[PDB]
Structures are given as structure tokens and as C-alpha cells.
From a paper:
Influenza virus replicates in the nucleus of infected cells where the heterotrimeric viral RNA-dependent RNA polymerase, with subunits PA, PB1 and PB2, is responsible for replication and transcription of the single-stranded viral RNA genome (vRNA). For influenza, cap-snatching involves the binding of host cell pre-mRNAs via their 5′ cap structure to the PB2 subunit of the polymerase followed by cleavage at nucleotides 10–13 by an endonuclease activity which resides in the PA subunit of the polymerase.
To avoid the problems associated with this flexible loop, two of the six structures described below (those of R05-1 and EGCG) were determined using a truncated form of the protein in which residues 52–64 were replaced by a single glycine (Δ52–64:Gly). For R05-01, crystallisation was successful with the Δ52–64:Gly truncation mutant in the P6222 space-group. Pocket 2 is characterised by stacking on the side-chain of Arg84 (e.g. benzene of R05-3A, R05-3D and R05-1). Most interactions of the compound arms are with residues in the range 24–38 (notably Tyr24, Glu26, Lys34, Ala37 and Ile38), which comprise a flexible loop leading from the C-terminal end of helix α2 into the N-terminal half of helix α3, but Arg84 and Phe105 are also involved in some cases.
Residue numbers in the entry: 0 to 52, 74 to 139, 141 to 195
The structure:
Amino acid sequence: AMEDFVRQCFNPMIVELAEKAMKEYGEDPKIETNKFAAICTHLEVCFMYSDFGHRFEIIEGRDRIMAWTVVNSICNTTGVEKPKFLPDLYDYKENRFIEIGVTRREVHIYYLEKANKIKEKTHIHIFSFTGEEMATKADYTLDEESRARIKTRLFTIRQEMASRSLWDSFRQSE
Ligand SMILES: O=C(O)/C(O)=C/C(=O)[C@]1(Cc2ccc(Cl)cc2)CCCN(S(=O)(=O)Cc2ccccc2)C1
Ligand SMILES: [Mn+2]
Ligand SMILES: [Mn+2]
């Protein structure tokens, strides 16, 4: 059962935030179990990305109002243009917002989908469960070790799902 997998694979904080995000956005984690797993995974990557730095402000994982309050605050103190859509992080070193993508498909495919969706100051960084990444301008932002740890965690999630015969379902759900 994917729902039970998610509850054993991710730390309690992450699972809580994923459940809250789903309800805030209408969804039931008991039904949309692949989505529930994807949201946890994406949350964890965002937190790991941010912990590898206080270089980053984490925007993902906050309730909508707080997320926009933070984004507004950053825009007001940097003059960086306000994004049309909530991004995932702000990079205080490069002074740009970052959109983090996690895909079960090819990274170039998901990159295009994201870049098309969001539109040009927001830096995009895409990770696969295959150790692939693609980023705006091939600027991967983090050092090699930080990206390697993210890649390892994603691949580990995939294999833990594969252990329980849940990977194939999860992969086709995107
Ligand atoms: O696709 C991403 O890489 C990504 O960063 C997605 C997001 O930020 C989502 C996350 C989300 C998805 C589904 C659900 Cl049910 C809830 C939240 C989905 C896109 C829209 N937004 S959102 O624009 O940030 C609005 C939001 C904020 C907080 C909680 C719920 C909703 C939240
Ligand atoms: Mn997001
Ligand atoms: Mn994202």
C-alpha cells in the first residue's frame, strides 16, 4: 500500500506538511497515494537543497499566505521581480528564486514543461530518480556533493518503492 509506504519512507514532519498541502489544495492522501508520495519526495528535495547552504529561503512547505508573505518580503528587500507562481526556494547568493522539479520522466521533458509553465527570472532545477538533472543555463547552483546526496535520496526512494512493487505505478502516475 503506497499510503503506508509514504508514512514509513518519509520523516513525520514531511508527511505532515504533505498532508496539509494536499488538503489546502483539495486532495485526499488516502486516494491520491502516488501524488502523496510525489509531494513528500518534492518536499524532501526542497529541504535538502536548502539545508545544503543560510544561502536559501525555503518557500515550499509553508502555507499559501506565509509563502507569499516570504516571497513579498524578499521582493521588497531585493527588487527581484515578483514571480507569477510560488517558487520553491530563494537563493540569497545568486539573488534569484528557484523552481525545483522532481520527475519520473526524462529531465529535459519535465524541464520544458516547467519552463513553459512558469515563465524567466526563476531558476529551474530538475532532478530525476535516475541521477539526472537539468538546470537553467546548466547552472546547477549547488556543489557536486549536495546534488549527489539529493540524487542518492531520490534513487533510494525509487528502489524502496521497487522493493514493494510500487515503483511502476508511481512512475506511470505523472
Ligand atoms: O510541481 C512542483 O515542483 C511544485 O513546486 C509544485 C507546487 O508548489 C504545488 C505543490 C502541491 C501539489 C499538489 C498538491 Cl495537492 C498540493 C501542493 C503545486 C503547484 C501549485 N502550488 S502553489 O502555487 O505553490 C500553491 C500552493 C501553496 C501551498 C500549498 C498548496 C498549494 C503548490
Ligand atoms: Mn513548489
Ligand atoms: Mn517545485
